Amino acid sequence: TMMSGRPGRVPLQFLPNEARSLPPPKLTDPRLVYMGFLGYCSGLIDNAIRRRPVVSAGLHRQLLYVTSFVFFGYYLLKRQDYMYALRDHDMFAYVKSHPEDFPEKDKKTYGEILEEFHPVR
Amino acid sequence: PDSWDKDVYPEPPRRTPAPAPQTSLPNPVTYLTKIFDLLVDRPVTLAREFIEQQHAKNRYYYYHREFRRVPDITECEEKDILCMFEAEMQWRRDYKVDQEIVNIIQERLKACQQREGESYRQNCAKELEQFTQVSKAFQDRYSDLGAHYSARKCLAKQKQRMLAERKAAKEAAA
Numbered sequence: 001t002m003m004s005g006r007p008g009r010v011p012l013q014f015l016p017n018e019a020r021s022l023p024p025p026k027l028t029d030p031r032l033v034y035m036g037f038l039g040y041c042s043g044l045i046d047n048a049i050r051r052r053p054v055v056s057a058g059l060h061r062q063l064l065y066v067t068s069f070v071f072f073g074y075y076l077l078k079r080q081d082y083m084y085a086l087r088d089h090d091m092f093a094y095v096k097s098h099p100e101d102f103p104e105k106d107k108k109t110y111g112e113i114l115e116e117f118h119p120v121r
Numbered sequence: 122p123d124s125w126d127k128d129v130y131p132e133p134p135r136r137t138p139a140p141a142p143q144t145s146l147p148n149p150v151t152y153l154t155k156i157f158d159l160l161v162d163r164p165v166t167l168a169r170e171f172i173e174q175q176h177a178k179n180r181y182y183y184y185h186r187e188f189r190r191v192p193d194i195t196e197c198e199e200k201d202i203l204c205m206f207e208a209e210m211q212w213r214r215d216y217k218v219d220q221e222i223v224n225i226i227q228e229r230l231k232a233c234q235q236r237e238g239e240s241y242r243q244n245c246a247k248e249l250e251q252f253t254q255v256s257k258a259f260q261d262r263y264s265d266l267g268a269h270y271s272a273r274k275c276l277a278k279q280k281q282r283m284l285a286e287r288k289a290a291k292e293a294a295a
């Protein structure tokens with residue numbers, strides 16, 4: 001477990017307060033559109049299994065499918081973005097606080113670097 | 122013709138002997154040439170005159186793109202992706218230009234062979250030496266880089282060649 005037991009972590013909290021400082025996902029997010037597509041597919045499959053007209057029947061039910069998927073997808077995307085931002089924050093903090101473990105290296109040009117040549121023949 | 126550069130594509134001056142007939146028989150070649158000029162050359166000349174008159178009314182121009190020089194892979198730092206990209210693109214353009222230079226020299230060689238005809242082995246010795254030198258340099262540059270060639274690989278090959286030359290010079294001086 002990498003980020004389990006992280007200091008200051010409140011248990012059973014889907015989205016902490018520190019996540020409010022990150023940019024929320026746009027409503028036209030391609031991931032949100034894909035979640036809505038999944039909801040629409042679920043509605044179509046529901047109509048197919050219940051032997052209703054797949055495309056025409058149950059418009060309210062299909063709309064509820066799409067809406068529920070979009071809602072949960074928006075919150076899931078918020079949590080995913082928060083976790084990735086937290087990972088980057090921790091990585092940068094560790095790199096900064098361990099300079100002897102992460103030292104800068106002198107940059108040499110390819111005019112100085114000697115690379116062996118392997119002819120293709 | 123001013124279409125191409127006479128210096129880049131040289132032509133020896135054309136020496137055509139004058140006719141010196143020895144018989145009273147008419148020349149069928151001359152008669153057929155007169156017929157050809159009367160029946161074909163004049164109509165095609167008039168057609169081209171009309172076409173060029175149409176072209177002169179709508180004159181417009183196109184240009185030759187100029188590329189400024191950019192730092193090469195020797196100057197680029199290690200894993201400096203932008204400099205590596207610029208250097209690789211420049212190296213590819215130079216490779217294309219060198220290929221076309223070799224093509225120009227080969228065209229010179231072929232034209233001189235055909236022109237000199239039965240005395241080509243002697244009169245085309247100048248164009249054979251230029252082709253030999255150009256092809257030697259081009260081969261030393263891009264001989265066996267491979268399908269996935271690059272400026273880095275060409276630089277490694279040049280470094281290997283320079284090391285071999287330095288070792289040979291040191292051994293000779295020893």
Ligand SMILES: CCCCCCCCCCCCCCCCCC(=O)OC[C@H](COP(=O)([O-])OCC(O)COP(=O)([O-])OC[C@@H](COC(=O)CCCCCCCCCCCCCCCCC)OC(=O)CCCCCCCCCCCCCCCCC)OC(=O)CCCCCCCCCCCCCCCCC
Nearest residue numbers: 040041042043044045046047048049051052053054055056
């Ligand atoms: C549309 C492209 C989708 C691509 C994939 C996307 C993901 C899946 C889609 C979601 C689920 C869709 C519904 C599934 C059930 C369909 C049942 C059916 O009959 O459907 C016919 C139905 C119309 O018929 P109906 O009158 O309602 O009822 C007739 C009976 O169902 C007649 O039924 P029957 O009694 O004759 O049933 C017999 C039939 C029953 O067969 C079926 O029911 C086949 C479909 C169900 C199988 C599984 C579907 C996929 C589920 C997810 C799995 C992964 C998918 C991706 C896989 C990729 C790799 C393959 O069985 C057979 O024929 C057996 C032989 C074949 C078996 C072997 C082949 C199996 C292939 C499995 C994979 C198929 C992938 C594509 C599926 C596309 C389905 C439309 O048409 C559709 O459902 C069309 C799809 C919806 C179109 C909406 C259009 C909206 C307006 C335009 C929008 C334009 C774009 C919007 C943007 C803005 C533009 C301006």
Ligand SMILES: CCCCCCCCCCCCCCCCC[C@@H](O)O[C@H](CO[C@H](O)CCCCCCCCCCCCCCC)COP(=O)(O)OCC[N+](C)(C)C
Nearest residue numbers: 001003004005009010011012013014015035072073076079
């Ligand atoms: C103050 C007044 C307002 C309070 C607001 C409420 C505060 C939050 C309340 C949360 C609900 C109350 C508790 C109910 C159970 C909590 C469940 C959830 O919230 O907890 C989180 C758990 O969240 C879920 O794990 C995320 C659900 C993600 C669902 C998708 C999984 C990803 C699948 C990948 C493919 C995705 C496909 C698309 C899916 C539709 C983190 O809790 P944690 O104590 O730390 O878990 C310990 C175990 N660990 C450490 C190993 C994780």
